[PDB]
Amino acid sequence: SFPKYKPSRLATLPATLDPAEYDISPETRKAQAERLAIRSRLKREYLLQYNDPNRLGVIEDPALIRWTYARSANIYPNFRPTPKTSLLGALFGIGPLFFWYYVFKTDRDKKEKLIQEGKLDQTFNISY
């Protein structure tokens, strides 16, 4: 026996180490055959559109339009106010602002107090 490989999000499971691959069955074989049939149909359509000498333009890719539309224009109509979404939006849109405001305010009050007491040594500080 040898030490076992532990998969992670950024280090996925190897293809040859998946327990599902070695569990062969007629249903799995049929599913793979159908997947390859779909891929073959799409490839045949693309090649038929590609090798045509009359075509003098790009081949429109409905997958690409669907991807771009879902990324950009389909976000809001499917949005729902949810405790997860409300809390995450509030956090990532408000917390950093107040955090940086507190940091800069504390720094500037410290600097102003030091100036008022005069113990800052601002000699040669001409350009501002």
């Binding site: 950024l10 976000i75 809001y76 979404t85 939006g89 040669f124 500080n125 001409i126 350009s127």
Partner: protein
């Protein structure tokens, strides 16, 4: 009058003429690389004169020739500094660059865009010369960014390769991380010292505070590829071999170290920053040597050796010996450039093969490269009276004979041992065993360009250390008295590393095979630093950039708050107001209610 200024500006000026002629007809012919090489050689032999004048007299200058914008009490001008550092580093860089272009004449013989390659090399040289001679921080920043952009362009020379573009972007990312500290230092210096000139900065800072020096240290770590920001230098070997030999081995990568050399009057007055510099250099050299001692790509091994030498330079800066670090820069340029040239020659001879597992008997198959690589390895590890001795031996003596940290000294010694280890690894795995290259032998060296370019740097790597050490004036107190055992610490450490690594490598012939240990996996995978740090942060950034920044706030909540709420409220109010069935009974009752309210409320 005083030809020092005329010559020292003429060198940099004539370095720019082929860039002007790049739009002429000569750029479209095959004589352009010869034009550039001749220009560089003439620039070197012309810059040899200010060096002679400095060695004779010690003459230094500041040439503030052109006046740029003046901003209230701050004046910005085109000012060049011609101290010892500039007048010494310019000839060495020009010599190395001349050798590099002579080598690239043969190495890039089949590249269609060879004139563009030579133009890029010349532009990088011009930007580096701008960086070295700069007298104010803005010109230094101009050079800092020019060399980085040229490195980005030259790493991704083959833009059809995904990995080249990835490496170029990696280098840009790390150099911008250093740029953060560089800009911090510039801002602090302008705000407090009221100037970016070196003279005023040195004058008004008798006891320099922490922040500007920390910014300078961050910039130096970014550009010199210290441990925190190291992997871009190993990854930069995607570019052509001349690029790896010129930029990422001898000239560009020392720039950050040079920066810390330029601000040494402020460096010596601060103790915490010196300790940070020494620790960073020690950890960098140790880690890079440990990663080097187990690599299979020869170019990767040479790059890791360069990074280890940079860490040693940073240690020397940290122990308050800037001049010795400059001397180390001068010697390292010579011998590391020649080593990379030998590697490129071997690479070309074996039909673009880089892994050492396919390189066998070359001691007799190619003799000139063999002797050049042997001399270079001996100089790098440190052989007495060679070019590497006059620098590295003094580095070791200064480290041993001064008030440092014990751990940094230990890591410096172990790094020296590991340097010997990877040198003997390269020699053994590439020159000693039986041949392992494909049967079609295409080994050839009969070309005057390659031989001349290698032999010039060979003469340099043999004589330049002695000549320069005996020519320059003394700039520090020597360690004239030493323990006898501590005088030979570097030599015995190097010999022990040589012998131990040779004995370990000789056991590969044994007909026994065992699975690797954890230390081998850790050292071969670069401490696993390139994996995690190039997968965990980036993803966690990019995902956020689409999940929170792009979709959650920009597309949903910012849209929900101002526009969508207004639209919904206006639609609801319009529907409520306009939805009247047209029955005058309701309108008349509302009018009666309004009349009653007006009579009972407005009086």
């Amino acid at each position: 009058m005083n030809p020092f200024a005329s010559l020292t500006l003429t060198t940099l000026t004539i370095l720019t003429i082929p860039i002007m002629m790049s739009n002429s007809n000569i750029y479209k012919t095959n004589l352009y690389p010869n034009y550039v090489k001749t220009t560089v050689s003439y620039a070197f032999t012309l810059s040899l004169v200010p060096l002679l004048m400095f060695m004779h007299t010690g003459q230094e200058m500041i040439i503030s020739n052109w006046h740029w914008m003046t901003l209230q009490t701050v004046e910005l001008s085109l000012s060049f500094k011609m101290d010892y550092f500039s007048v010494m580093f310019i000839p060495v860089a020009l010599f190395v660059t001349w050798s590099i272009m002579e080598f690239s004449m043969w190495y890039m013989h089949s590249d269609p865009f060879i004139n563009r390659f030579f133009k890029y090399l010349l532009l990088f040289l011009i930007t580096m010369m701008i960086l070295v001679t700069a007298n104010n921080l803005f010109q230094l920043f101009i050079g800092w960014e020019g060399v980085g952009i040229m490195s980005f362009l030259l790493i991704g020379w083959w833009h059809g390769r995904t990995d080249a573009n990835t490496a170029a972007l990696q280098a840009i990312l790390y150099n911008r991380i250093g740029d953060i500290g560089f800009v911090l230092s510039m801002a602090w210096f302008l705000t407090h010292s009221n100037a970016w000139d070196l003279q005023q900065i040195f004058m008004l800072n008798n006891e320099c505070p922490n922040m500007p020096l920390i910014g300078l240290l961050l910039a130096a770590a970014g550009k010199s590829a210290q441990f925190g920001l190291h992997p871009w230098l190993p990854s930069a070997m995607e570019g052509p071999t001349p690029v790896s030999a010129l930029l990422h081995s001898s000239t560009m990568v020392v720039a950050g170290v040079f920066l810390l050399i330029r601000f040494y009057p402020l460096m010596e007055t601060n103790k915490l920053v010196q300790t940070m510099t020494l620790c960073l250099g020690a950890i960098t050299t140790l880690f890079t040597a440990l990663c080097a001692i187990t690599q299979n790509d020869i170019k990767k091994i040479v790059a890791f050796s360069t990074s280890s030498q940079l860490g040693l330079m940073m240690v020397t800066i940290g122990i308050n010996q800037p001049h010795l670090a400059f001397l180390h820069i001068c010697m390292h340029a010579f011998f590391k450039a020649m080593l990379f040239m030998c590697s490129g020659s071997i690479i070309h001879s074996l039909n673009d093969e880089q892994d050492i597992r396919k390189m066998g008997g070359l001691y007799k198959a190619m003799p000139f490269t063999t002797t050049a690589l042997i001399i270079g390895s001996l100089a790098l590890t440190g052989m007495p009276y060679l070019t590497g001795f006059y620098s590295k031996d003094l580095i070791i003596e200064a480290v041993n004979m001064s008030y440092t940290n014990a751990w940094a000294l230990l890591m410096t010694l172990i790094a020296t041992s590991l340097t010997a280890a990877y040198s003997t690894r390269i020699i053994f795995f590439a020159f000693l065993g039986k041949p392992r290259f494909p049967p079609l032998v295409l080994i050839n060296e009969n070309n005057p360009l390659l031989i001349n370019s290698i032999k010039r740097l060979l003469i340099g790597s043999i004589f330049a250390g002695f000549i320069i050490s005996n020519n320059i004036p003394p700039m520090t107190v020597p360690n004239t008295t030493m323990p006898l055992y501590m005088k030979m610490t570097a030599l015995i450490v190097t010999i022990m590393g040589f012998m131990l690594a040779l004995e370990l490598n000789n056991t590969t012939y044994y007909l026994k095979f065992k699975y690797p240990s954890q230390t081998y996996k850790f050292s071969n995978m670069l401490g696993y630093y390139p994996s995690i740090m190039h997968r965990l942060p980036t993803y966690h950034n990019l995902s956020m950039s689409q999940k929170s920044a792009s979709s959650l706030l920009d597309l949903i909540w910012l849209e929900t708050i101002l526009p969508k709420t207004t639209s919904f409220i206006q639609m609801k109010m319009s529907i409520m107001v306009s939805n009247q069935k047209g029955l005058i009974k309701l309108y008349f009752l509302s009018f009666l209610i309004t009349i009653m309210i007006s009579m009972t409320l407005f009086n």
